Design a protein around this ligand. Structure first.
Ligand SMILES: Cc1n[nH]c(=O)nc1Nc1ccc(C(C)C)cc1
Ligand code: NA
Ligand SMILES: [Zn+2]
Ligand SMILES: [Zn+2]
Ligand SMILES: [Zn+2]
Length: 100
């Protein structure tokens, strides 16, 4: 992945509620291929289901999203995966919820 991108500044503090990697899409309710937005922590489905996270990027401009399938982080502006120290806390909290 890229070691940095100019949109990491838009990653917001993790809710005290934590993350639920089984949360469904906020628009269509699917349990498949969901992502969480790292700006406002809403959950929406991926490009191969109904494309609601791409729609959320378009209507909010929020840049960076985390996959509940593989814990990768994608930037919609850079069109690339990113890994950085600024993403470790959210990835680690998601890993703990997913795997125990
Ligand atoms: C996460 C993601 N979202 N949109 C997209 O167009 N591509 C994405 N992933 C992706 C995975 C593999 C590759 C390879 C073929 C270089 C490219 C993009
Ligand atoms: Na589809
Ligand atoms: Zn959806
Ligand atoms: Zn968002
Ligand atoms: Zn970026």
């Amino acid at each position: 992945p890229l070691p940095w991108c100019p949109h990491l500044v838009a990653v917001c503090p993790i809710p005290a509620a934590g993350l639920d990697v089984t949360q469904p899409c906020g628009d269509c309710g699917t349990i498949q291929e969901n992502w969480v937005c790292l700006s406002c922590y809403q959950v929406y489905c991926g490009r191969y289901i109904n494309g609601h996270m791409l729609q959320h990027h378009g209507n909010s401009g929020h840049p960076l999203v985390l996959s509940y399938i593989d814990l990768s982080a994608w930037c919609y502006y850079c069109q690339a995966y990113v890994h950085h120290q600024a993403l470790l806390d959210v990835k680690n909290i998601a890993h703990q919820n997913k795997f125990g």
